[PDB]
Each structure stands twice: as C-alpha cells, then as structure tokens.
C-alpha cells in the first residue's frame, strides 16, 4: 500500500485538480488556504502550491475556533474535528465564498463540499450538492471527472 | 505567526525539555521521532530538532497501521486515534524502548507516557506513571516536577 509521504504528495495534486474547476467571484492574486484541525496528509499542502496559471497557493494552519475563517481564506482543508468544532467552522464560513475540502470522507454530510478518501491505491473524493450550492463559489461539473477517474483501477 | 504556529513552536520546546529527562538503553546517534495520526501541532517537530547535547532529532510521519513503529523510532508523537488504532499502535510498541507523547489527552489513563494539553495560555502535560513504569526507557523523576 501507499505510504504517508506518497499520499501527502497526491493530496496536493488532487487539491490542485479540484481548484481548477472552481471560480471565486473576486479572484485574489494569491489563493489562501487554511488548514484547520488535526491532519495526517496536509504536510505537502503546507509547503504552498502553484496553480497552472502561476497563481500561488499560500497555506497555513488556523485554530478551529477562529471566528474570521470565512474572511481569512479562500479554501479550507478540514481535519479531524468534533461535532461542536465542526459547527463552529461552518458557522464561520456561512455567507463567505469559501471552498471546503475534508481530509476524511465523513464531512460531506455536515458542510464540507468535497471529502477525500485517502485509503486504497488512489485518492478519491465525494462531493455534496447542498454545500456546493450555498458556497458562494462556482464549481464546474466536470470536477467529478477527477473523482471518477481516480476511482478507476 | 498564527496561534497554531506559535503553539507548534511551544510544542517543540516542551518535547525537547521532556527528552532531556529520558534515557535509552542503547543511546542512538540520531534520535528518531515518528509522528503518527492526525495532528495540529507537529509542524515544528517535522522540521527536525537538535538536542542541547548536540544530538539531532530526525522526525517523520508514519502510518497508524505501520507494524514496525516499535523498531522504527525512539519517540512517537501520537495524534488523534480511535480505540482500535490506539491498541494497534501500542501493540507495535510493546517490548520496545519507545518514548510516547500524545498531542491531546483528557484522560492520560491508557496509552502514552505523557499527554500534552496545548490549550490555555501555556502548554501543560500529564504523566501516566503506569505506562512510564513499563516502557524500556529510563524516565528521570524530576520530569514529574514539570508535569501538571
């Protein structure tokens, strides 16, 4: 099976994929990613990233209970938080144009737009239509080409 | 610097502190640290560290179900794990001289020798005297004066 470092490297490439199907009403010069909560696979992200057009993705960790997350970032990578913490996070994001992605595949029921599944041979993901719809960003539907091909041996 | 980044530095400093009160049966030239499980505050550790005595601490992430954790490291820094994952981890550690520190720990009853509480204005930690007693590493008792 795949090692942690292998998976971490893949997670950032999947994230770059997802980002390509997403549009922010006010596109920043630098995309800001916040990592929130304990994570296993964010060490790659946290080195910062570059998109194909050369836009930099700056990444940093932030407290679960920071009330300004909606304002402080364009993207959130959500780690393994509890019911009360998760509610805090998605309350803070409501109203703002933020893309949310969870490290684990259980947060798609509770507010995350995309949920990663890092086990198995490839990284796959699922998405939630309700959360996408209320998000404030636009997500091209082809984003699922990425998930489907990822789930194909 | 975010609060998470400042606490991660503080976590680094607390671990180095704890390390100075710990001795290994056969002392390695390089101290291996494994970060296992989801963590918020290990980014400082993962950049690597050096002990006051000059010894380098090599850190890396390893998987919860890595069966060789006991032989792969001297210190394990343990993140969020469920019951099964915790039991799994400690089975791999059984019979090996491994220092164990968990990032959370509202109980510190079962598992790690030390449990951080990174909350509040300062990092505090608790000791599990049972886990310490049967660990293979020598923990100097002064370290309990640094616990809460």
UniProtKB/Swiss-Prot annotation, chain B:
Binding-site list for GMP: 23, 138, 140
Statement: the UniProt record of this protein carries the keyword Disulfide bond: yes
Main location per the UniProt record: periplasm
Effect the entry attributes to changing residue 73 to S: Does not affect folding of the protein
Entry's localization field: Periplasm
Cellular component GO terms held in the UniProt record: periplasmic space
Signal peptide positions (record): none
Keywords: Disulfide bond, Periplasm
Regulation: TpbB/YfiN repression is released through an YfiB-dependent sequestration of YfiR to the outer membrane. Binds vitamin B6 (VB6) or L-Trp at the periphery of the dimer, and both VB6 and L-Trp are able to reduce biofilm formation induced by YfiB L43P mutant. However, VB6 or L-Trp alone may have little effects in interrupting the YfiB-YfiR interaction. GMP enhances the binding affinity between YfiB and YfiR.
Subunit structure: Homodimer. Interacts with TpbB/YfiN. Interacts with YfiB. The YfiB-YfiR complex is a 2:2 heterotetramer.
Entry protein name: Negative regulator YfiR
Organism name: Pseudomonas aeruginosa (strain ATCC 15692 / DSM 22644 / CIP 104116 / JCM 14847 / LMG 12228 / 1C / PRS 101 / PAO1)
Residue span relative to the full protein: 38 to 185 of 190
